[PDB]
Amino acid sequence: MKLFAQGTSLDLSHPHVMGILNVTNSLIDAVKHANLMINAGATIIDVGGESTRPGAAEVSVEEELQRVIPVVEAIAQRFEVWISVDTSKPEVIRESAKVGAHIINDIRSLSEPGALEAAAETGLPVCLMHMQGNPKTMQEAPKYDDVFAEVNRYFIEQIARCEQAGIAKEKLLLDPGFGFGKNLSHNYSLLARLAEFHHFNLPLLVGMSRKSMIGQLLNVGPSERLSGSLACAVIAAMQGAHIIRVHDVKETVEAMRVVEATLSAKENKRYE
Amino acid sequence: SMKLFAQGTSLDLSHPHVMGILNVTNSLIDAVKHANLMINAGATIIDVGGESTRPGAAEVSVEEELQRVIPVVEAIAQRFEVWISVDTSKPEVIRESAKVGAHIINDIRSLSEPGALEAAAETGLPVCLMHMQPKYDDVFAEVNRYFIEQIARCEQAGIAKEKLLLDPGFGFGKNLSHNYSLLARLAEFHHFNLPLLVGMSRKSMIGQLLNVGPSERLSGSLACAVIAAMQGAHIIRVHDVKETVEAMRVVEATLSAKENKRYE
Numbered sequence A: 001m002k003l004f005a006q007g008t009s010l011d012l013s014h015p016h017v018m019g020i021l022n023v024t025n026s027l028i029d030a031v032k033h034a035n036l037m038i039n040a041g042a043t044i045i046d047v048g049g050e051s052t053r054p055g056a057a058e059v060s061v062e063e064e065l066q067r068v069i070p071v072v073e074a075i076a077q078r079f080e081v082w083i084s085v086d087t088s089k090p091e092v093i094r095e096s097a098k099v100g101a102h103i104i105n106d107i108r109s110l111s112e113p114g115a116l117e118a119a120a121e122t123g124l125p126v127c128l129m130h131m132q133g134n135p136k137t138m139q140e141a142p143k144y145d146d147v148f149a150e151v152n153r154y155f156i157e158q159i160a161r162c163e164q165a166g167i168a169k170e171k172l173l174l175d176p177g178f179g180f181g182k183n184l185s186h187n188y189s190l191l192a193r194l195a196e197f198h199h200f201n202l203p204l205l206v207g208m209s210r211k212s213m214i215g216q217l218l219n220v221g222p223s224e225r226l227s228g229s230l231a232c233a234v235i236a237a238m239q240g241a242h243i244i245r246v247h248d249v250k251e252t253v254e255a256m257r258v259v260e261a262t263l264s265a266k267e268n269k270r271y272e
Numbered sequence B: 001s002m003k004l005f006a007q008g009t010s011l012d013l014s015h016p017h018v019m020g021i022l023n024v025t026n027s028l029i030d031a032v033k034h035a036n037l038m039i040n041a042g043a044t045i046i047d048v049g050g051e052s053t054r055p056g057a058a059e060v061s062v063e064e065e066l067q068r069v070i071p072v073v074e075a076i077a078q079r080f081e082v083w084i085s086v087d088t089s090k091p092e093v094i095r096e097s098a099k100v101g102a103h104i105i106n107d108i109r110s111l112s113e114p115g116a117l118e119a120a121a122e123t124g125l126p127v128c129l130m131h132m133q134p135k136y137d138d139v140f141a142e143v144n145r146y147f148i149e150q151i152a153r154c155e156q157a158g159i160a161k162e163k164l165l166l167d168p169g170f171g172f173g174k175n176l177s178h179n180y181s182l183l184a185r186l187a188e189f190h191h192f193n194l195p196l197l198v199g200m201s202r203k204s205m206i207g208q209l210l211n212v213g214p215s216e217r218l219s220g221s222l223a224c225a226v227i228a229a230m231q232g233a234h235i236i237r238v239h240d241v242k243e244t245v246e247a248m249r250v251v252e253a254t255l256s257a258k259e260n261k262r263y264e
């Protein structure tokens, strides 16, 4: 199980840690932070320029290009690391591919006008994330009859939608979208059955780091969630998740080494 | 609904419990202060011993061990609602510990000193059976045989299975791969239908994997703890109580959403 982009590959026979690079002098700072994450063992850096704060204005395309593209460029021309770009905009997808981005990580699963066409044209790997609704209102009244089944249907549909637009299965990643239109119980139901998303035979990406599903469980603020975030990370990676998206790279990578040592000793190579 | 009973109280093993490790080195005030901190961090069991009772630690007379151990156990039993595990190999310390309110006998020698087995039987308290020996033909199968044997040995001495806890003894005569084989197959030790105790906190199986010193092993210890608890381990023995407890709460929320209630 591998991904291919920009003339290199990513071997997903073991879990990978994706370091969050939020870019919502900031370019030098971004590069310093990317460097630190790389040294800590991050093998993918997720550059993100539009925040998902519910009440917030969406950023203009011109602002998102300014924040994201120089950052992706700087990293591509300085380090060997893979680069994911956190955008929903066709122009940012195109421009990012041109400066060396490896993965389009769209929380909206290319639902923006032109997004699907633009991603198809880059030939890059694409991460499809479940979200119910949109970021402005998704957390008001998250509701599911069966949250696993509903997220699973969604993946079937979006995969079909990507293949129709000319994007091959082999470029797709799936992410259940923890905290995107989900209460606490919804999130833990998905984490508990995460292994069951392997039937698609596609890489699994998860981002639980410092999210509400830890905050609400422990009643702590965003800077007290490391231990819970690691637990989430380990729970996911023990079920064969391929990419773990986190703030605290060093600590996550240490935990993943322990998961790898455990999975290596297992005949199965997975828990369910 | 696995449950232990001791000293007129019970321990509900439908969820994982964190056992904090307490050092005994004035020292009695400090012990109680550290026990208090671990309880406030969410420890439901306190394992009295730590660095005074580690392998390689200086041996002591019966008289010295009673003097250092029994007051600590007594002080904790009087002040806190918590369960108390006592680290000792000596029959006298077993007897006296039970008299002052200890709940669990934790002997890393598996009651092999003369009289220890008999004394533990007499207390009626729960007893931890930990594997210790590095070289194995099949580490899981050998650790598993040892549990079969020690359970029989304990039942023959009059200690009912319902008082037994099984611990594979990470780091006790085990290289790195032996330790991860056992961790990987931990869930298979449930066929005994007995509680499972594990202690990986800051051990070599982390330090050697990550090549870090004893103080830089928290993240790896937490992963070990989560890996064990996801597999239905009932007690987790650690230095870092607060963080481990937070991780266990995540494990609990996950296992509650799970229909199975366990991974394997």
Ligand SMILES: Nc1nc2[nH]c(S[C@@H](C(=O)O)c3ccccc3)nc2c(=O)[nH]1
Binding pocket: A051, A052, A053, A054, A086, A105, A106, A107, A127, A129, A175, A177, A178, A205, A206, A207, A208, A209, A210, A211, A245
């Ligand atoms: N693929 C993928 N991309 C992601 N981007 C994010 S942003 C999120 C955060 O908590 O970082 C967030 C949510 C709300 C406000 C700010 C930031 N989360 C994911 C995820 O879970 N998967």
Ligand SMILES: Nc1nc2[nH]c(S[C@@H](C(=O)O)c3ccccc3)nc2c(=O)[nH]1
Binding pocket: B054, B055, B106, B108, B128, B130, B167, B169, B170, B171, B197, B198, B199, B200, B201, B202, B203, B237
């Ligand atoms: N039941 C039970 N009791 C235990 N006592 C210990 S002492 C160990 C440590 O790392 O604390 C240790 C081992 C070697 C040297 C120093 C310290 N480990 C366990 C365990 O794994 N289970």
